[PDB]
């Protein structure tokens, strides 16, 4: 096992959604090195590679999630913490 700072929080999960359902949905983006769901239909997913997280935020956000029981919901996928710089070389810029 291993962990990363390439983390997204997922929301709007059905209460019957398992971390295995979550991992199965998010693996479309890349390798999941840590996953977990909580009580309130919320979860975290950590990716081995940053670019795979970015894909998840871009492509898996607002998608149809189907739990193992068959419960469907449209989920929210966003980066946990301050977002990553978009492509191109880094620049120091004030934000918020």
């Amino acid at each position: 096992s291993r962990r990363s700072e390439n983390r997204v929080v997922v929301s709007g999960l059905p209460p019957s959604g398992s971390w295995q359902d979550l991992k199965d949905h998010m693996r479309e983006a890349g390798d999941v090195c840590y996953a977990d769901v909580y009580r309130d239909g919320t979860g975290v997913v950590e990716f081995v590679r940053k670019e795979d997280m970015t894909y998840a935020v871009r492509k898996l956000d607002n998608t149809k999630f189907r739990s193992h029981e068959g419960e469907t919901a449209y989920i929210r996928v966003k980066v946990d913490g301050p977002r990553s710089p978009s492509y191109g070389r880094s620049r120091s810029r004030s934000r918020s």
Partner: protein, 901 residues
């Protein structure tokens, strides 16, 4: 062209697999690559398999067949499908005893074919009742049956969400037939590992798909057989790995313990029986075997995490689960315990989340057992020469330990733990490596320890400073980091300030200890700045000769940051005097570089951090800015071609300006001139950003408003040229980003100056084109500008000039309003990711505040012009947006609506 000659493909193959040279092996690869990409690939691969010269070429052919099926399946006429299936089945039949590495590739190909051939329904059934009776067919039939469920999650196949669901339940239907088949295989006397491994890998694979019946598997010989070979010492390493992986798969397949309790019970009891075999494996030096046991254990606790948490100790929550981990944790090899780290995180996270600390007391002893286990794992080798390196493989482990301790410490009590670790540090004549490791775990938690029980806390600090220099380098280092983490105890007990400082100063004067010391010094300066006016003499003296201590750039900056934080607390009178000395050492170093390899970055970064954090309350700094500007302007001008240096140059100037503010007006025009002249030949987008800062700082003063507008209009000419190029927006997102941060500062400091200008017309135009730019930073900057622009025709009606601004925006809205709304709606539905929706909604929102009735028409027109979607859906979306009373509702409307596309 035409298909390559076989002699040629045979030549390229032998190179790729036997030619030691890198340049040639690469060349063969591309040609074989083009062969694979080509249409001839099918035919060549098929020939190579019929000829079956050797293992190499059959492997290349099998792989190519597989690749063409999982990427290029579309370019096959429907009629060809049945024949390709017949080829692959004949091929895997003929080549089954050639090499296993060839059978897998062909097996993979057949699986990829079945998943993509709806005309091949019931393929599992087809395959089994066709090959199960031939005893020599079984190894590749199992292989196909093994890779088929693995390929359902193939990123290489990327089957649609709906088609994938059909697939899985179709497979679920036949899971019995393969289990039945799987049972028959082991259903013999004295079966060898080779057959057993195929059975377990196959079973595990169908478990992972989540289509096996828990209730049928609970009472089934395969499970008993799994734990059986996992108990037997005689079993080989390879049979072990297969058996273990299948157990972890069985566990993983249990998603809800309640629905799969029979299976759950079977697995729980099964794994507890393995502790003897673990000890036997550790009795030998069979590390491969123990790693397997720790994974099975860790997977078990993961599976029953809910029960360990909700109802600990009782039944499913039987805490022997955790004990098995603590056994693994005691193992001298740290690669064993790190297997379990993710479970511990997840366990701690769950206990914390469900805040019912009534139960928490039961876990404390387990965590403190784990912590002591991790404490010894952090011990460096007694023959370690230097400081503890964080970069190496073991230093990585310590950090994962350090992080895990921070997250679990609440279950023990940070104070309880901190004191207890320190106590043990005089008993037993401890070797340096036992002290360091205890100091290390102490540093991990020293921040979270409550300063209420001050006596035990403040005496630990007193213990660390009385350590002699004679102690091991690594002990001096970690104690420096512990002290650094204990700045709040130096803040509450100011008498310890001078001893701590004196101790850190000693470490600073030794080369391999400097950075750790400088960081600790920075912490002290940051937390204890309130009363450190006395020590400033020393900090300044360090600064006067900073590059002598062999510091890292970061530790250096942090040091200067520290001294600047306390300079700001000094009496206002001495600030202006000391600040100039603080900067002079930098200015002198830069001055040398102008007459000098010359890279001014570090002194630019050191100047920048000084300004950034020399922030007193009143100004003394603008006096110093005059001293700085001439050397910066020449530095800037010398490296005006280099973006990286200029960017650091502008960063420095950004913070110098932010420090002062409306003062230091002596720099505005000479900087603007230099910026505009340089930007003319080198379009560094940070001049736009620097420009936005000057506008942010001097935009209200109407004396500067003309000069600032001239700056913008001058900067925009090479800017628009840039964005005018092919892929101009995509290639210069930094320019778009910084251009509209600039435009935004104008539109909120002096809007009318910008709106009545001629340059606003191209700016607005580029904004509308920029709304479809798929670049998050640049797009935020654009949406923000549009929002702030349109809001100007609504904002602050209390001031006089409101009616003028009202008219200017109305014109803009008249001219462009309907095109913007169409663009915004376009980017949401087709171009950009869902995270842009809240930014779009805010622009749309401002348009309603300006003229909702016109907007209702505009939006209606936009929804009218759309290239699957019912008229009812367009209507109620229009209904949702226009009837929104909060901005939030437009976003929800877009969120929902976007899904339709």
């Amino acid at each position: 062209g035409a298909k390559p000659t076989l002699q040629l493909v045979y030549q390229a193959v032998q190179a790729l697999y036997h030619d030691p040279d890198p340049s040639g092996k690469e060349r063969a690869s591309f040609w074989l690559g083009e062969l694979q990409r080509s249409v001839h690939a099918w035919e060549i691969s098929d020939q190579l398999l019929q000829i079956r010269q050797d293992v190499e070429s059959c492997y290349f052919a099998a792989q190519t067949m597989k690749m063409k099926i999982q990427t290029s399946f579309y370019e096959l006429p429907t009629d060809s499908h049945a024949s390709l299936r017949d080829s692959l089945l004949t091929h895997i039949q003929n080549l089954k005893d050639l090499s296993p590495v060839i059978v897998t590739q062909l097996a993979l190909a057949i699986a990829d074919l079945a998943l993509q051939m709806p005309s091949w329904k019931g393929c599992v059934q087809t395959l089994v009742e066709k090959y199960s009776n031939d005893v020599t067919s079984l190894p590749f039939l199992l292989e196909i049956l093994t890779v088929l469920p693995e390929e359902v999650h193939s990123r290489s196949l990327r089957i649609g969400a709906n088609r994938r669901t059909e697939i899985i339940e179709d497979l679920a239907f036949y899971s019995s037939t393969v289990v039945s088949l799987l049972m028959t295989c082991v259903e013999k006397a004295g079966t060898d590992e080779k057959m057993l491994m195929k059975v377990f890998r196959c079973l595990g694979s169908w478990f992972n798909l989540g289509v096996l019946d828990s209730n049928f598997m609970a009472n089934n010989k395969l499970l008993a057989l799994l734990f059986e070979v996992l108990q037997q010492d005689k079993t080989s390493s390879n049979l072990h790995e297969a058996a273990s992986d299948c157990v972890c798969s069985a566990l993983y397949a249990i998603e809800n313990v309640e629905t799969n309790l029979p299976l759950a019970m079977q697995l729980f009891q099964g794994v507890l029986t393995l502790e003897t075999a673990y000890h036997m494996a550790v009795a030998r030096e069979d590390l491969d075997k123990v790693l397997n046991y720790c994974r099975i254990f860790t997977e078990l606790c993961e599976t029953f995490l809910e029960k360990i948490v909700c109802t600990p100790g009782q039944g499913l929550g039987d805490l022997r689960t955790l004990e098995l981990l603590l056994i693994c944790a005691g193992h001298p090899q740290y690669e064993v315990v790190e297997i379990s780290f993710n479970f511990w995180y997840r366990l701690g996270e769950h206990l914390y989340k469900t805040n019912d600390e009534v139960i928490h007391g039961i876990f404390k002893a387990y965590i403190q057992r784990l912590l002591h286990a991790l404490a010894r794992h952090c011990q460096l080798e007694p023959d370690h020469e230097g400081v503890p390196e964080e970069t190496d493989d073991f230093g990585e482990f310590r950090m994962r330990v350090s992080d895990l301790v921070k997250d679990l410490i609440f279950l023990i009590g940070s104070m309880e733990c901190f004191a207890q670790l320190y106590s043990t540090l005089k008993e037993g004549n401890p070797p340096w490596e036992v002290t360091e490791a205890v100091l290390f775990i102490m540093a991990a938690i020293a921040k979270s320890v409550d300063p209420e029980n001050n006596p035990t806390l403040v005496e630990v600090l007193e213990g660390v400073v009385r350590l002699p220099e004679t102690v091991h380098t690594a002990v001096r280092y970690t104690s420096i980091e512990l002290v650094g983490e204990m700045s709040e105890v130096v803040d509450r007990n100011p008498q310890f300030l001078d001893p701590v400082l004196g101790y850190l100063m000693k470490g600073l004067c030794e080369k391999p200890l400097a950075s750790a010391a400088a960081k600790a010094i920075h912490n002290i300066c940051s937390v204890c700045r309130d009363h450190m006016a006395q020590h400033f003499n020393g900090l300044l003296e360090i600064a006067r000769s900073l590059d002598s201590f062999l510091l890292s750039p970061e530790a250096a900056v942090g040091l200067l940051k520290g001294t600047a934080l306390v300079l700001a607390r000094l009496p206002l009178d001495k600030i202006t005097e000391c600040l100039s000395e603080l900067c002079s050492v930098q200015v002198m170093a830069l001055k040398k570089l102008l007459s000098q390899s010359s890279d001014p970055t570090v002194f630019l970064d050191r100047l920048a951090v000084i300004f950034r954090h020399t922030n007193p309350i009143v100004h003394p700094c603008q006096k110093v800015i005059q001293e700085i500007w001439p050397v910066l302007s020449e530095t800037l001008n010398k490296h005006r071609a280099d973006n990286r240096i200029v960017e650091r140059c502008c960063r420095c100037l950004r913070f110098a300006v932010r420090c002062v503010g409306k003062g230091s007006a002596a720099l505005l025009q000479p900087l603007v001139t230099q910026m505009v002249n340089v930007y003319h030949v080198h379009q560094h987008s940070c001049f736009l950003y620097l420009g936005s800062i000057l506008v942010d700082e001097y935009g209200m003063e109407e004396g500067c408003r003309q000069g600032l507008l001239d700056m913008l209009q001058a900067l925009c000419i090479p800017t628009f040229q840039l964005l005018e190029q092919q892929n101009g927006l995509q290639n210069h997102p930094d320019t778009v980003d910084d251009l509209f941060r600039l435009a935004t500062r104008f539109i909120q400091r002096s809007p009318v100056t910008l709106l009545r200008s001629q340059v606003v017309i191209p700016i607005l135009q580029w904004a509308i084109a920029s709304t479809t730019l798929d670049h998050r930073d640049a797009n935020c900057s654009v949406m923000r500008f549009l929002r702030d622009l349109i809001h100007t025709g609504v904002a602050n009606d209390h001031e006089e000039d409101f009616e003028l601004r009202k008219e200017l925006i109305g014109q803009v809205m008249n001219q462009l309003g309907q095109q913007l709304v169409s663009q915004l709606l376009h980017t949401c539905c087709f171009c950009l990711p869902p995270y842009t929706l809240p930014d779009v909604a805010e622009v749309l929102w401002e348009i309603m505040q300006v003229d909702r009735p016109t907007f209702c028409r505009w939006l209606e027109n936009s929804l009218k012009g759309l290239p699957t979607v019912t008229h009812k859906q367009l209507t109620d979306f229009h209904k949702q947006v226009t009837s929104a009373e909060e901005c939030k509702q437009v976003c929800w409307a877009l969120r929902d609506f976007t899904r339709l596309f």
